Structure formats: structure tokens, C-alpha cells
Amino acid sequence: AESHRLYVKGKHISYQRSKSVTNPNVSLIQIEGVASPKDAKFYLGKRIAYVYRAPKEIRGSKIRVIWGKVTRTHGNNGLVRANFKKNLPPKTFGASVRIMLYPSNI
Amino acid sequence: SSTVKAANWRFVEVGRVVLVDNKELATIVEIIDQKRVLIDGPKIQRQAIALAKIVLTPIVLPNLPRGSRTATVTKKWAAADIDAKWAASGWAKKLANKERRSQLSDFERFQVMVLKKQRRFATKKALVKA
Amino acid sequence: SHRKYEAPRHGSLGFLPRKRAAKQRGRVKSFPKDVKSKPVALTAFLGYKAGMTTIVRDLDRPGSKMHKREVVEAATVVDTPPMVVVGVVGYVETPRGLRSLTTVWAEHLSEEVRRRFYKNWYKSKKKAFTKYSGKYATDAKQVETELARIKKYASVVRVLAHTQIKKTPLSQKKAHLAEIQINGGSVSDKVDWAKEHFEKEVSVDSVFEQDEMIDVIAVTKGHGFEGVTHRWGTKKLPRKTHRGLRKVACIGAWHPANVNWTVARAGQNGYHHRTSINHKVYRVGKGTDEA
Amino acid sequence: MKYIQTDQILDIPEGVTVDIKARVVKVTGPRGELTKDLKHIDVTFNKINNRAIKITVHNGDRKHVAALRTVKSLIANLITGVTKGYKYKMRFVYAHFPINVNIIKKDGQDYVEIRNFLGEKRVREVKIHEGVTMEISSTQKDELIVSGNSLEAVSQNAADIQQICRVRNKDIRKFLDGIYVSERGTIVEE
Amino acid sequence: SRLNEYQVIGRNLPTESVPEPKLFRMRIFAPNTVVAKSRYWYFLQKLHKVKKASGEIVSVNIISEAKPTKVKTFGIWLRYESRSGIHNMYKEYRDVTRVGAVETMYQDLAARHRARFRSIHILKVVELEKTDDVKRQYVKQFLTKDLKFPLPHRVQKSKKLFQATAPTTFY
Amino acid sequence: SSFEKVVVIDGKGHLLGRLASIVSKQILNGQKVVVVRCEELNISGEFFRNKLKYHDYLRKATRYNKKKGPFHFRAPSRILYKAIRGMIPHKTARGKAALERLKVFEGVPPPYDKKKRVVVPQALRVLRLKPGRKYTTVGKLSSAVGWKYESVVEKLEEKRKVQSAEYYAKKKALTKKLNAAKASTAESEAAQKLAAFGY
RNA sequence: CGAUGAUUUUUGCCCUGCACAUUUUAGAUGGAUACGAAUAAGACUUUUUAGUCGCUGGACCAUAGCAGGCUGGCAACGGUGCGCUUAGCGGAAAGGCUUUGUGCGCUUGCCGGCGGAUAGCAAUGUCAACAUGCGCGGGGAUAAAUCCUUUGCAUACGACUUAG
RNA sequence: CAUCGGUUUGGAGCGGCAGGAUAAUGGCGGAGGAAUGUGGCACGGCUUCUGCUGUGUGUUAUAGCCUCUGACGAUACUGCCA
């Protein structure tokens, strides 16, 4: 009962980019404990939430969310590409995201 | 006396039992180079492999001639009963326990936690008086 | 192109920047290295420059043409009344340098040293060190605890001493308070020596003997803003030079397209911190001596 | 070429007990004990019996194989240092100015004090290494005897003494003055 | 490369003068049959008045190893070009397949002589049947009786970036 | 692979640049890293070679004003810091935050003397260099170029190791007592079932 | 970056136990889980001969209960949280690590009784540490600096050394 | 959320078929041979002969290996599956 987590911890690492040009429409996400594309393919299609705090309350809450989903793997070390409804702001590079366990296929 | 501390290495020699792919056993039948050996076993394909791709086990299949064919290796492996010798070591036992843990379900993990609580109760009771 | 002829640089790059000293009291940058086998003793003293005089002395230097012959020599008089010990500081060896751990003070500080802690003494309630003076209440175990901390952790022990400037003819009433490192003996010996000397006077004859070679730490004479000719000893330009001659003609080549730090420039001259070494002690005079 | 295996055999005399643990050799004999660290080399040791020790290099290249017989020789020098000792003899060579060599003791330390070398007013002092004995030979005129269990220490003191007496600004083919090692043997003659 | 041994057979195109020209065979170590037939014509024009335009490829067949799990020693005779001249050399390799010895040879002359694939001619690959046929000491040292050797200083590959225990190299 | 709140790395036996690159990627990705015992770090190559390299570094200074030029830090932690900062886009706000996520020390000062130090196998000298190669200890290179506190750190490191040894002897004793208590409760109903589950 | 002195008789300041409301977050969401050293080596037992361990943390600790409610019993005399309380160690940036007694809880070690619905098939579905302010409660202390005049160890002016 | 259509990236994917030296191997059988010569035998150095061991001999014995081959049976690789 000390733990209540139902999501996998993630991190917003980067945008999709070449050396000099970045693409904000695609985010690179590191899922915790995933180290290979085979591990990361479990999470394809799962929903991602970026949860953050804002100055103004909306309906009594200062917590806002940007929703996304895992679309594909990236590279060889278990990062994935994510697609959020609104692009994650660049200030969140290194910020933690929530990898949801739904849509479930277990 | 002299009292020289000697290394306890595992040697690349004909008769060494090795793990391949961290799953299957095989034995060295002939040395190709410093880097390559020819391995064979009852449940593996006779092949030339690099010593970096395998792990030497502490087990030697005694009296295996160099270059022995598959039939000779299988017969001597069955006679020496290498599979039982492997399965009796802490290395194989840890591998088996890792597999068994990896096959648990959520309900079985819950039961593991409950039984651990009971055993910890008993252990603390024993520890406080000793 | 190279210089047509060679010449040494004007002035030393080891005394930069030629700025005013941050304080008028010269500070001991480095103390003598501590030797445990020696007795516990002070390593420095504070005095006031009175003036210069002349002596006559028989030279004892075999092989010299002045050997066993009288020489007339300039000498400096430093007025040095005894200093009063009022405190002790412990220093700890750290991977970032020495760090002061604790400062323990004496119970009673004279007014001349308590004026040190004020910019406007005459307008004050003179509250300095009153609660600390209360710390000595009937058992003084707080002071003993801090002293034990110094004994336990300090590797360098320095005493806090102030001059008795009221014994000098100066009109200034603030004493000069400085840290003087204690050398010799163990750390416990140093702390005991400092404690037993609280509110006591220490004389020069307990720090310096005659014929000693000692160093002098002081801030030199101020001259204000000075041109390059006297600040750096550069050559005066010819008499017929337009816009003046007390200058450096070329303050740099075209490249680097900046003025270099090694070029002599006009600025503040004097009032620098200097450490001057190897001054022989001809006399440690006594104030009570009428001769 | 990466030689598959190279071996050397130590020979341990009757009264000597070599002792190796983690490439730290401790040789004990009638004359005392000597120790040597070989942690800068990758070698392994096998005790064949009480009179032989195998020294092995596995899959070693040319230089790493070259470092094997030197390990053997160093341990052998340790063995012969604790069972026979080492003795270097130095002869005083001078054409005109006699070299005045004394064994002095200053500050609790032994020194070899060379005076009048080529008539110089300078006094040369050489610190005597620990475990090394200096002696002015009685049986020979102008002879210094450097002896001890450690060959390295003995030879290095002898080299210190020889090197401090070098001639400067002269034709050293003509000005042959100095102190030179004339005999390198053992304390116990064989 | 990753190579195969090929049997390539070709001939001059028949003429009314010569209606059955002689069939010539070559053993070619090539990654595929396109390079196998290319290498064949390269060597025939070094030896015969023939071209790909005036010739005909008759057969291309893979030559599989006879005993692919028997350890052998091969002698390979070479003719390679350096930066300065052309040299003949002979080297020896230990392997279980004839193809794998040639692959090692190509890596070896790349490493020791900076000799590229284009600069090398394989004159002959021979399996050395007798232990007396072995001339080179770098393969003769593995033909000694009761050969044993350890592998000191084992480095274990970790899946994680950080390890909570001290590293070890026993083996 | 877990995200940790702080990763404290014991810098002993680590190659300077490999540890620097790994730590750079760690702090860029939002991980807080502490490296202790930077005086025990290693650089490949003999001591003289690395000292010559540091003297090449010292040569470089702004000609018109030496106070503007590169600031050559002599402490081992600052040598590691320079190596890391060269691998960071330190002139952006993001690189500045990433550098704020990092701490480097000589020795193991509090509070890290009672915390867990890990190693980085991809950057360990004993696992990376060929066993015959020569290497440098950054503590010796630092002293040779001006670092003043080598002997202070080793005095404080010996004091810490004496205290850390008392810890381990106590911890080992309680592990021995707990093992004897777990042996008593073996072959019990809970213990037999836990053995069939792999525990 | 450290040590140290003094910190407004103003309704202002400090320390402290709460209670409430706010702003912020380079980014809590069970636990940063503490020997040292070697690596051609470590650690057990006999014997220094030999056998055994590792071959990764997929580990260890913690983990069940309206984000964890209300009650009952059995077995043990243990485990754990909080509050006082005892003693010791820690100065590298100690600000932490242990420890004595005591009291109040909880205990999932085992067995019971009652409660959760409707947030509607998901919507972070809001649960944390740091800070500040404001109300109370309990204690506590009761300054200086600058301008100005002066000095000349200083000085272009600032600044500095003095005195008032 | 479901299902569809278009495009597309995958799976430790599964099955069937074909080709090749109608794979080469391997296993089983037969014939021949040798050594980095197993047992045995004959001399030895350390072993109460405690994987004892070394050197000779010779050809399966108390291990085996190589070559050729006879009848089967697979697999690899490359293609095809509307």
C-alpha cells in the first residue's frame, strides 16, 4: 500500500533530429527498464501522459496533462518514438513522463 | 616449504564442458586457435565456435580423445553423466531458480509475499532470542 | 620587426596589479612552518614605524676591506609596546585549504580593542562582547567546550592579539588586532599557552632576539595616480615631442589588436602590500631603560 | 606472434624457502630475508616441488615473453643473496692526488666520504643504502668493499660511488682518476 | 568478404574452325555467383586469348567443404601487390572449412600488408595432411600434444550502465 | 537501468574520458550524478605523457590579458569536470541545468561516505585497457601540476576507511546472526513453499 | 567559502509547537540498499595439499487492508510508527550514525464480522518536499551603518586611515 | 472503444513446396591407413606405482582418429505459396 503506481516511468529525452535540425512533432522517450527494441515493442501503442503544474487553476486543479502514444521504437537501445497531441515543450528534455499500461493487450 | 599460491583458472582443453547461449552444454573436442575451438554435445550441433561466445564450466569430461566424433562424445558424455554433474552445481541451480522465478504469475507473486511475511515473522522470533 | 636593440623590461610583473592594498594593516601571507620539538612561541609581532636613525658599528666580516673597521649605517626604529592576547582560533585541514573551526575570546577586552569593532564608537551603546562576557558565568564551561573542540580538531592554532596603541603618540584610538600563529609543541600545548595568556601582555623580547633576521609586512607609501615615467621607470621622450613626453610611445603592436597587460600604463603608485625579508635586529630596546 | 606458453624453472637450494603470494616474492635463507614486488608484470607461478618453481607467461607477445627470464633472474638473485651474499670491490685510481675515503657517521647515518679527488677541496658524501655494508679493505691498498644481501642495493651503492667521482672539463682518456668496480662476486666464495 | 568456393567452367565460343573448344575450370572464392563469374574472366584473360564477349560460362557450382567439422591446417599460396611491387608469399591458417581459411587470409593481408581484395591472387589453397607439412610456427604451436591454456583476465559484459559490486576478472 | 534519485559513482579505477562521456549523457537525460574519489581516476598512457599533455594545456592563455584566458584547474575533480564539460553544450540553459545536476569530489566527503557508491563497467580501467598498457592516476598528475591537497586527502581517506571498516565488521556480524536465524526456520511450511516458487 | 561580535522599547525582531491559505519547482510517485584491496586475483573449510562460491541488480529490503475504514478472537512477548527519554560516536561540507528506558498506537504471524456501488466503459482525476505569508500559543533579546564635521598614514572624484 | 478501407513498420512468428553433389556433413555398416601412438610391453625420475609421468615399440587392445565407400534419414542455404 506504500506503492500505487500503475504506469511505467519514462523520460522525455529529445526530439527527432539530425545534427542541426530538430523535429518537435516526434519525441524520443526512454522507458525505464527497456534496453532493446524487443523490450520496447511491448509498449507500442500505449498512451503517454506528461503531467505538469501550472499557475492558474482549471476547475480547482493546478495539474495539467499532455497526452500521447508510443508509435515505434528508436535505435537499438530501447528508446521509442512518441506522438503527443501537443508537442512536448523543449524545456521538458529530461523530464519524466508516464507510460500507461493501456490500451492493454495482455 | 615454498608455499606458492597458484592460479585456479579454467583451461581450454579437450573435455571441458562449456555453456553455449547460457542455455545448453557442450564439450571442447579440439582446439583450433587461441580464439577458436571445436565443440560438441548431445543436445548441440557440432560446430566451430569462438571462445568468446562460450563460458568454460568447472567440469571436465575425463579421457576424451582429441577430435572425437559425435558418437564418441555422446557415449562418453552419457558414461561420465555430465548432465547430472552440471545440474548439481550452484551455477545450474541459480539458472534454474531464475527461470522458475521468471515463470511466476501475479497470484503466485502475492503468495510469495505472504509466505515471506510468515517466514520473516518466524525468523525475527528466532533471532531475538539468539 | 624586432627591436633594433635589446633592453630589459621596465618593472616587475610579479607585483601586479599595482593597485591599492585592500587594508592598511599588512597581513602575514605565510607563517613560519611549525616544528613540534620547539617550545611554544609566537611567530610575529605588531609595531609602529617611528623613524630612521644612524648608528656606528664595527664590522666583523673577514676578507672584507671594512673588517674590524667602523661603518655608518641607516637604521629604522619600530615602536613596539607589548601586545595583549585576547583570543585564539583553531584551523582545520580540509581538501579545500585551512578552515577556521572556532574562535574563543577572553572574558575582558580593553576599550581600545573594542573600538576596533566600531565605525561610530561615540554614537554607540558599546554592546560588543557583552553577552560573550556573560558566557563566563560561574563555570565557563562553554569556553572550555570550545577550547576542547580546538584541541580535538585544530591543526593550526593562532592567537588573537592587539596592539596597545594608547602607549604610542598616535591620536588613533582603535587598536590593531591580528592573528599571530603559534608554533612549537602539540596543539594541546598551543591551546593551553593561549588560554593562560588571555588578557596578558606579550613583549617583543619574547618574540625577537638581537642579531635575528626578521621580515617586515607593511603597506608602502601612497603616491596617488602616477604617470608611466615614474610608476614604471620608462625613458622620457625627446624634448620636442608633440602633446608631451612623460609617456610610453608604443603601447602595442597592431596584433594582438588589444593592449597587453605587460605594457606600462599610468595608474595608482604606492600604497602596496609588501613583504620585505632579511632585516637584521640591531637592538631590542626596553621602554624602562633611561639609556 | 603470441606464443601460446613460455616457462622458466627456478631452482631453490636446500636451505632456502621462496614464498610467493600475489606476485610478492619473499625469499628466506641462512643470510636473512629479501622481498620483491613484481606487480608490474603479468606472470603466474607453480610450485613443482620444494626445489623447483615454474614461472609461466600465457599467450604473451615478444616483449611480455622477454619480461619472463628477467623475472627468473631477479628471483634467482634474491635466492643467491640470502645464501651467498654479494660483494663488489672498488679500486681507487689516481695519478697524482691520493683519494682519501672514509666511512663516516653523521646524523645517525652512514656515509662514504671521498676527499682530495683530483686535489679538489670539495668533499663528496655518498649515503650508504640500508642493508649494505661498506669496508676499507685491509688486504689491499686503495680498495673499498661493498657487500650485502641485495645485489640491486650493493650494485647501486657501488654505482653511486663510481658516478660521484667523474672528471669534468678534462680528457678522461688521460685523466683516468676515479673509483671503479673491479670485482663483482659473492661474500661466500664458490 | 563472406565467401563461398565456386567451380566456374567456361570456354571460347565455338567456331566452324573449332566446334568443341577446350573447357577450363577455376576454383573461385567469391561472395556470390556474379563476382564468381567476374573473377573467372579476370583470370582467363591473364592466361588465354579470351574475353567475356568471345567466351561462354558453362557451369557455376558451389564446392562445399568435405568435412566441415574436422580441424585442418591450410597452406595458401599468394601473389599480392604492395605499394611498390608484386610479391609472392605463403601463409598458413587453422580452420574447419577451406572457405574460412581464405576469409582469414583476406583479413590478415588487409591487417599486416594493407593488401586489399583487388590486390591479391590466390594461387593455391592446400590442406596440410602431415604435421611435417606445417612450416609456420604460429600454427605449429597448436599441434603439440595435450595442448592446454587458460584465458586469464576475463571481461564480463554487463547489460546495465552501473554495477553495485566490485568488478572481477577470474576465469 | 532504473532511474535513480542520485547515482553516486566511486571514481577509483575509472578511465577519465569514458566515465566523462557516460556521466555527460546521464546528466543530460535528467539524472543526478555524484563522482567521489576523483584522485583515484585513471588516464591511459604513462604518467610522463599525460603530464606533457597537461603542460601543453598550460601553454594556452590569453596573450593580451592572462586573466581572460583558459583557467587551468589542477584538482582531480576539476580535471574530470573539464572533461565532462567538454562533452556538454554548456553555453545553453539546458547544458547549464545538466551541469547543475553534477557534483565531483576528491575523497568521499559527507554525506556520501555513508551512501552506496557504484561502478561503471564500460569505463573501468581494469576491464577496458589491455593488461599490459601503462596508465596514470589523476591524483599523481594533479600534484605534479600544482594541486596542493594530496596528502590532506589521503590522511582523511585513511580515517574514513578505518570508520568504514568498523561499519562492515558490524554489518557482517549481524548478517551472520540473521543467517543463523534463517537456518533455524528452514524446512518449515512457509520455507518449503517458498522453495518451490524459486525463493 | 569559513569563524566570530552585535543585532533597533520598535509593537518592530529572533527561536519554537501548531493551524490555515498561498507562490514556486530543469521535474517525488516503495527504498541513493555505505568495507577495503587485488584483478596473472578475491572469499570460506580442512589442510596450505585440496575442494567450494561468482559466470551480474531478473539481486536485497520493503510490499495485502475506504491512498488503506470500523470492530472481535487466537498465537507470540516478537516487528514497526510516533512522543518523550539515556548514553556514545561523527569536523572533509561534522548537521548524521548508533543507543537506554518509557508511553501511546498499528501489526498481514493466524482466523472472523461489517463497509466501498452511481466517478456510470478511460479522462493525472488531484494524496509529495522545499518556501513564504497570515492567525494563535509558549519563550527570548533590546543595535548599528551612512550622511555631516574632523584627520592626512590617503586622495582626481568616489574610496581609505582617524577622531567626534 | 470496435470494425472497415488505403499506406506502412514489425514478430525469437508458424506451416507447405522446390532446387543443389536430388546439399556437403553427421549417425549406422564395410574396407584400408597412419600418429600429436590408447592399452599392453621394455627401460627410467619422483611417487606406500594416488588423472604419476618420460622415452622407445607398434596399429585397437582397457581410448580413439583419418581416408574411401553402401543403403537410408535430416539440416543449412537460396527461392516459391493467388
PDB file of C-alpha atoms in Angstrom, chain F residues 10 15 24-25 30 38 41 45 54 66-67 70 88 92 96 107 115 121 124 154 161 163 171 179 181 183 189 197:
ATOM      1  CA  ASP F  10      33.132   5.659  -6.901  1.00  0.00           C
ATOM      2  CA  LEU F  15      39.096   5.919 -17.253  1.00  0.00           C
ATOM      3  CA  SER F  24      27.559  13.561 -19.594  1.00  0.00           C
ATOM      4  CA  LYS F  25      24.791  11.502 -21.168  1.00  0.00           C
ATOM      5  CA  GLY F  30      17.977  14.377 -16.162  1.00  0.00           C
ATOM      6  CA  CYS F  38      38.378  11.775  -8.350  1.00  0.00           C
ATOM      7  CA  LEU F  41      40.680   8.207 -11.568  1.00  0.00           C
ATOM      8  CA  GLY F  45      49.207   6.350 -21.134  1.00  0.00           C
ATOM      9  CA  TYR F  54      48.765  18.978 -19.245  1.00  0.00           C
ATOM     10  CA  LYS F  66      46.287  36.268 -18.837  1.00  0.00           C
ATOM     11  CA  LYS F  67      43.241  36.726 -16.576  1.00  0.00           C
ATOM     12  CA  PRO F  70      41.599  29.408 -20.024  1.00  0.00           C
ATOM     13  CA  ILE F  88      28.143  19.133 -22.680  1.00  0.00           C
ATOM     14  CA  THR F  92      22.900  26.816 -23.364  1.00  0.00           C
ATOM     15  CA  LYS F  96      23.770  24.671 -17.574  1.00  0.00           C
ATOM     16  CA  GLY F 107      37.849  11.663  -1.415  1.00  0.00           C
ATOM     17  CA  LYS F 115      25.886   6.056   0.932  1.00  0.00           C
ATOM     18  CA  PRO F 121      31.966  -1.200 -16.118  1.00  0.00           C
ATOM     19  CA  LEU F 124      36.631   0.756 -15.677  1.00  0.00           C
ATOM     20  CA  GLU F 154      44.950  10.611   1.881  1.00  0.00           C
ATOM     21  CA  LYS F 161      38.413   3.681   5.718  1.00  0.00           C
ATOM     22  CA  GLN F 163      35.498   4.023  10.195  1.00  0.00           C
ATOM     23  CA  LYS F 171      27.254  -5.315   9.374  1.00  0.00           C
ATOM     24  CA  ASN F 179      21.707 -16.252   8.524  1.00  0.00           C
ATOM     25  CA  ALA F 181      18.139 -17.436  12.328  1.00  0.00           C
ATOM     26  CA  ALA F 183      18.674 -21.554   9.001  1.00  0.00           C
ATOM     27  CA  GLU F 189       5.930 -24.922   5.967  1.00  0.00           C
ATOM     28  CA  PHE F 197       8.401 -20.782  -6.029  1.00  0.00           C
TER      29      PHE F 197
END
